[PDB]
Amino acid sequence: ETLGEKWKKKLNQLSRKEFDLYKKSGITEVDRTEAKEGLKRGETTHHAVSRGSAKLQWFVERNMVIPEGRVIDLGCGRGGWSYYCAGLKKVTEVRGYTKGGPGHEEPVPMSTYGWNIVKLMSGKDVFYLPPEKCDTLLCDIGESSPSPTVEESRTIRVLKMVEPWLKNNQFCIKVLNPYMPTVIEHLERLQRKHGGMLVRNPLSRNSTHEMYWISNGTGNIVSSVNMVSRLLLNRFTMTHRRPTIEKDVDLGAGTR
Ligand SMILES: C[S@@+](CC[C@H](N)C(=O)[O-])C[C@H]1O[C@@H](n2cnc3c(N)ncnc32)[C@H](O)[C@@H]1O
Ligand SMILES: Nc1csc2nccnc12
Ligand SMILES: Nc1csc2nccnc12
Ligand code: NA
C-alpha cells in the first residue's frame, strides 16, 4: 500500500467540517475577490476567468514549461490557461478544447491581452479528438473521485491520450493520481521517452494529490510523489494553517 493510498483513506474519512479545515491548510492561493466582482459585472479586461491562470503562471515563471508557437489547451474549461498563454511573447496561437454541457465549464469570452490569438471550442471531448500539430501541449483534465482505482483509470486514460500530441514540444499535463503503482509505471515510461519531471504546484489544494508533468526538468518521479504523500499526510496532524494569500494575475487588455 502506497503512502498516497494511506492519505486517500484518511481524506475519505473526514467529516465535511474537517475536510473544509484541511483542504487549504498551509497552501498558497490568489485573492479572487476583485476578479469575481469584475466578472459578475461583465468586465472583459484584466481579470483571469478562473484560478487556473495563476496556477499555470506559477510553472511558467519558473521556466518549467515555456509556452511558444501554437499552444493546445486540453480541457480549457472557462479558459484560464489559454488567456494566460495568449499574453506571452513566444506564443502565436492558442486553441482551447473543452467538453462543456451539464457538469462541465463553458469557455468565458474575454478581451484580455492577446485575446485575438485565442479560439476556445466547447462540445469537444478530447478522448475522441485526433492529435494536431502544436509547439506547446497543455492538459488540465482529471476528475477527482473518492475511489483511487477510478482515479487511476482516469489518469492513465489522460496519459495515453496526450502522448500522440507530444512531438518534441513544450508540455504541462495534470496527473490527477500520481501515486498508484500502475500510474508510476506509465510516468516512468513517458519520462524515458519525452523527458520532463513531475512537480507539485503550491496553489493545489490538499484535497488533491495532483502533480503536473512539465517538460523542463529532470528528477526521480517516485521520490517526488512520496514527498507529496508525506506533506499531505503531515497536513492532517496540525490545526489549520491559513493559506499564503497572493495577488491574482492582471491579464491586461488589447490585441497582440
Ligand atoms: C481543472 S478544469 C481546467 C481549468 C482551466 N485550466 C482554467 O485555467 O480555467 C478541467 C476542465 O476539463 C474539462 N474536461 C473534463 N473531461 C474532459 C474531456 N473528456 N474533454 C474535454 N474537456 C474535459 C472539464 O469540464 C473542466 O472544465
Ligand atoms: N465527493 C465527496 C462528497 S462528500 C465526500 N465524502 C467523502 C469522499 N468524497 C466525498
Ligand atoms: N468530506 C469530504 C471528505 S473527502 C471529500 N472530497 C470531496 C468533498 N468532500 C469530502
Ligand atoms: Na460545472
Of the candidates 112, 40, 46, the one whose C-alpha atom is nearest the C-alpha of residue 83 is 112
Q: How far is the CA of 78 from the centre of ligand 4 (A)?
A: 10
Q: Which residues are annotated binding-site positions for S-adenosyl-L-homocysteine? A: 50, 80-81, 104-105, 125-126
Pocket-testing residue among 30, 112, 122, 140, ligand 1, by greatest number of atoms within 8 A of Cβ: 140
Nearest CA residue ID for atom 1, ligand 3 = 16
Kindly give the number of the ligand 3 atom that is closest to the alpha carbon of 18: 1
Q: What is the DSSP string of the chain?
A: --HHHHHHHHHHH--HHHHHHHTTTT-EEEE-HHHHHHHHTT--SS--SSTHHHHHHHHHHTTSS---EEEEEET-TT-HHHHHHHTSTTEEEEEEE---STTSPPP-----TTGGGEEEE-S--GGGPPP---SEEEE------S-HHHHHHHHHHHHHHHGGG-SS-EEEEEES---SHHHHHHHHHHHHHH--EEE--TTS-TT---EEEESS----HHHHHHHHHHHHHHTTSSPPPPPEEEEPP----S--
Dihedral over Cα of 187, 213, 228, 178: its sign: negative
Distances (CA, A) of 58 to 81, 245, 246: 11, 14, 12
Residues with CB under 6 A from ligand 3: 11-12, 14, 16, 19, 207
Residues with CB under 6 A from ligand 1: 50, 52-53, 75-81, 97-99, 104-105, 124-127, 140-141
What is the phi/psi pair of residue 38, to 5°?
Answer: -70, -40
Q: How far is the CA of 101 from the centre of ligand 2 (A)?
A: 23
Query: Whole-angstrom Cα distance, residue 202 to residue 189?
Result: 26
Query: Whole-angstrom Cα distance, residue 78 to residue 30?
Result: 17
Query: Whole-angstrom Cα distance, residue 168 to residue 248?
Result: 32
For the chain, list the domains and their CATH numbers.
Answer: 1-256 (3.40.50.150)
For the beta sheet containing 136-139, the strands, ordered from the edge strand earlier in sequence to the opposite edge, are 118-121, 91-97, 69-74, 136-139, 170-175, 211-214, 197-199
Decide if 119 contacts 95 (C-beta within 8 A): yes
Distances (CA, A) of 73 to 14, 43, 88, 118, 222: 34, 23, 14, 10, 27
Instruction: Pick the ligand that lies closest to the CA of residue 16.
Output: 3
The structure's method of determination equals X-ray
Resolution in Å, one decimal, please. 1.5
